[PDB]
Design a protein around this ligand. Sequence first.
Ligand SMILES: [Mg+2]
Length: 47
Amino acid sequence: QPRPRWSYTPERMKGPGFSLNLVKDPRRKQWMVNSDPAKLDAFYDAF
RNA sequence: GUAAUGGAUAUAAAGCUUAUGUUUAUAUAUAUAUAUAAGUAUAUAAAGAGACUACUACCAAUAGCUACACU
Ligand SMILES: [Mg+2]
């Protein structure tokens, strides 16, 4: 049984695990993305 | 209001696709022999010359003109 491609990232495409580029504001590094399939279906049944 | 030709704020990454250099021996055996030694040319001439076209010359064919001085 494989995994849905939208759920995970290919393990072999990741690298060191830390970010090599500098950021001016650490607050801009945060953003909440949706991962609930049920919540995604609540939008299609509307639109 | 002013600034950006490598702007700005985020995002991803890792044994080398750098506009840069120097070097380049066969055979045999467990030193001897041979004599420059990585290999390569589906790349590279113009002292002069050929062909085609054009220009400048020379030349006077073709064409036009001249007969009571030709027939
Ligand atoms: Mg004539």
